Amino acid sequence: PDLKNVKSKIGSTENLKHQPGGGKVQIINKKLDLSNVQSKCGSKDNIK
Amino acid sequence: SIQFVDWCPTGFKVGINYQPPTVVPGGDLAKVQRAVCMLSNTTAIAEAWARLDHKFDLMYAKRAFVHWYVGEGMEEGEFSEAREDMAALEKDYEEVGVDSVEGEGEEEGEEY
């Protein structure tokens, strides 16, 4: 006898393209703007 | 050392009932408070299926007993169809034994 060609069915041989692929993460951080800010009591200029 | 497949991430299943094994008259077991059935899927049986497929080949090579089947209205092509299916199986049972290896060559360190 002869079998010519035969192969397995179905598993890890059909998976070899798809890893799958991974990704990327990031924070999750900010600031605030302070540029407007002055004190809200204010007598010391009255020295004038 | 009770070897699982290397790939295995999980490979147990549990089930629990309160009824114990029961004694039948004429029976052969001792009366006990507890018991376990176990079903194991394993690559090892596949070599025992090569024993049977070699036991197929050795007769088919001699067309031993073959005529008992052709006259029933199925073919010598219908033995080889079913034979080619045992080969796809033998070759896939090998594949699920693999140590997640999908490589082509081997590699060596530094020795003296």
Short mmCIF file of C-alpha atoms in Angstrom, two decimals:
data_model
loop_
_atom_site.label_atom_id
_atom_site.label_comp_id
_atom_site.label_asym_id
_atom_site.label_seq_id
_atom_site.Cartn_x
_atom_site.Cartn_y
_atom_site.Cartn_z
CA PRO A 1 0.00 0.00 0.00
CA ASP A 2 0.52 3.75 -0.38
CA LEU A 3 -1.11 6.77 1.34
CA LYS A 4 0.37 9.45 -0.94
CA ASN A 5 -0.30 12.34 1.55
CA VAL A 6 -2.07 12.53 4.90
CA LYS A 7 -2.21 15.10 7.74
CA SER A 8 -3.64 15.92 11.15
CA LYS A 9 -6.95 17.66 11.87
CA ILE A 10 -7.50 20.31 13.68
CA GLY A 11 -5.35 22.24 16.12
CA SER A 12 -2.06 24.13 16.64
CA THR A 13 -1.05 23.75 12.91
CA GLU A 14 -4.05 26.00 11.97
CA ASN A 15 -3.17 28.67 14.59
CA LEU A 16 0.30 29.78 13.48
CA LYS A 17 -0.75 33.20 12.15
CA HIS A 18 -2.75 34.46 15.15
CA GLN A 19 -0.70 35.09 18.35
CA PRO A 20 -2.71 37.12 19.35
CA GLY A 21 -0.95 40.49 19.36
CA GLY A 22 -0.72 42.80 22.42
CA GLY A 23 -1.30 46.52 23.12
CA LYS A 24 -0.37 49.67 25.14
CA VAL A 25 -1.57 51.48 28.27
CA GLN A 26 -1.23 55.05 29.53
CA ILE A 27 -2.00 57.21 32.53
CA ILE A 28 -4.40 58.82 33.91
CA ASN A 29 -2.89 62.14 34.96
CA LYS A 30 -3.52 65.89 34.51
CA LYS A 31 -2.78 69.28 35.98
CA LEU A 32 -4.85 72.29 36.90
CA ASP A 33 -4.35 75.95 35.73
CA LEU A 34 -3.22 78.37 38.49
CA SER A 35 -2.65 81.42 36.23
CA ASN A 36 -5.82 83.39 37.32
CA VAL A 37 -5.20 83.21 41.09
CA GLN A 38 -4.71 86.05 43.62
CA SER A 39 -5.40 86.38 47.38
CA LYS A 40 -8.97 87.35 48.37
CA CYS A 41 -8.13 89.45 51.46
CA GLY A 42 -5.83 92.38 50.78
CA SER A 43 -5.26 95.36 53.10
CA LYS A 44 -1.42 95.86 53.06
CA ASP A 45 -1.52 98.31 50.10
CA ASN A 46 -3.64 100.64 52.25
CA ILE A 47 -0.20 101.84 53.65
CA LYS A 48 -0.63 104.30 50.77
CA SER B 1 5.67 13.01 37.07
CA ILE B 2 2.09 11.93 36.37
CA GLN B 3 2.66 13.65 33.08
CA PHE B 4 0.01 16.03 31.75
CA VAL B 5 0.48 17.65 28.34
CA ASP B 6 2.99 20.45 28.60
CA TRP B 7 0.58 22.94 27.14
CA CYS B 8 -2.03 22.22 29.82
CA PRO B 9 -3.30 25.33 31.67
CA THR B 10 -6.25 23.47 33.26
CA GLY B 11 -7.08 19.76 33.07
CA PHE B 12 -9.35 18.59 35.98
CA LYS B 13 -13.14 18.51 36.35
CA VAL B 14 -15.00 17.60 39.60
CA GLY B 15 -18.44 16.21 40.42
CA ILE B 16 -19.84 15.05 43.84
CA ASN B 17 -22.97 13.05 44.77
CA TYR B 18 -24.24 11.92 48.23
CA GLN B 19 -25.30 8.37 47.17
CA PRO B 20 -22.52 5.79 47.71
CA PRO B 21 -21.94 2.78 45.43
CA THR B 22 -24.68 0.17 45.88
CA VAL B 23 -24.28 -3.63 46.40
CA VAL B 24 -25.95 -6.02 43.92
CA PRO B 25 -26.63 -9.66 44.86
CA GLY B 26 -24.08 -11.93 43.30
CA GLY B 27 -21.79 -8.86 43.33
CA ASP B 28 -18.02 -8.61 43.75
CA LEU B 29 -17.36 -5.22 45.58
CA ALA B 30 -17.10 -4.38 49.27
CA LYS B 31 -19.64 -2.09 50.96
CA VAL B 32 -18.07 1.40 51.43
CA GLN B 33 -18.85 4.91 52.52
CA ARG B 34 -17.28 6.55 49.40
CA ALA B 35 -16.23 6.14 45.74
CA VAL B 36 -14.67 7.66 42.58
CA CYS B 37 -15.22 7.21 38.84
CA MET B 38 -12.49 8.74 36.73
CA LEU B 39 -12.52 9.45 32.92
CA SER B 40 -9.07 10.36 31.43
CA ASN B 41 -8.45 11.79 28.00
CA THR B 42 -4.77 11.02 27.10
CA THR B 43 -2.37 10.67 24.18
CA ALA B 44 -1.26 7.23 25.31
CA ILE B 45 -4.12 5.20 23.81
CA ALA B 46 -3.02 6.30 20.39
CA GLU B 47 -0.17 3.71 20.37
CA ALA B 48 -2.81 1.03 21.16
CA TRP B 49 -4.68 2.37 18.13
CA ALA B 50 -1.47 1.79 16.15
CA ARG B 51 -1.49 -1.76 17.36
CA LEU B 52 -5.01 -2.08 15.89
CA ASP B 53 -4.15 -0.21 12.65
CA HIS B 54 -1.08 -2.48 12.24
CA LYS B 55 -3.37 -5.47 12.85
CA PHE B 56 -5.52 -3.95 9.98
CA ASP B 57 -2.58 -3.47 7.64
CA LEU B 58 -1.18 -6.89 8.08
CA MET B 59 -4.42 -8.53 6.82
CA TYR B 60 -5.28 -5.92 4.25
CA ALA B 61 -1.78 -6.49 2.64
CA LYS B 62 -2.98 -10.11 2.21
CA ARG B 63 -6.58 -9.04 1.30
CA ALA B 64 -7.40 -11.49 4.13
CA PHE B 65 -11.10 -11.88 4.76
CA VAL B 66 -11.77 -8.92 2.35
CA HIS B 67 -14.38 -10.73 0.19
CA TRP B 68 -16.71 -11.12 3.18
CA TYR B 69 -17.24 -7.35 2.97
CA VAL B 70 -17.21 -6.47 -0.77
CA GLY B 71 -20.20 -8.76 -1.38
CA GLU B 72 -22.19 -6.73 1.16
CA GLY B 73 -22.10 -3.77 -1.24
CA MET B 74 -19.22 -1.64 0.08
CA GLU B 75 -15.78 -1.29 -1.60
CA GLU B 76 -12.07 -1.94 -1.18
CA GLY B 77 -11.97 1.84 -1.65
CA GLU B 78 -14.20 1.91 1.47
CA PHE B 79 -11.56 0.11 3.55
CA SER B 80 -8.92 2.60 2.36
CA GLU B 81 -11.20 5.57 2.97
CA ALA B 82 -11.55 4.39 6.56
CA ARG B 83 -7.86 3.50 6.72
CA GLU B 84 -6.75 7.01 5.65
CA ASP B 85 -8.88 8.41 8.54
CA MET B 86 -6.97 6.32 11.12
CA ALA B 87 -3.82 7.99 9.69
CA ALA B 88 -5.17 11.53 10.12
CA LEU B 89 -5.90 10.52 13.74
CA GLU B 90 -2.53 8.87 14.53
CA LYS B 91 -0.89 12.05 13.14
CA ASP B 92 -3.11 14.42 15.17
CA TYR B 93 -2.61 12.50 18.48
CA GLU B 94 1.05 13.01 17.88
CA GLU B 95 0.29 16.76 17.44
CA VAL B 96 -1.64 17.16 20.76
CA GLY B 97 1.31 15.43 22.49
CA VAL B 98 3.68 18.18 21.31
CA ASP B 99 5.39 20.33 23.97
CA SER B 100 3.96 23.46 22.28
CA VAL B 101 6.94 23.17 19.88
CA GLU B 102 6.40 24.52 16.39
CA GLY B 103 10.06 24.68 15.35
CA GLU B 104 12.17 23.07 12.63
CA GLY B 105 15.80 22.48 13.97
CA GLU B 106 17.64 22.15 17.24
CA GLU B 107 20.08 24.39 19.14
CA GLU B 108 23.16 23.93 21.37
CA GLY B 109 25.13 25.66 24.15
CA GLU B 110 28.81 25.69 25.16
CA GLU B 111 30.25 22.46 26.56
CA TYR B 112 33.63 20.69 26.84
#
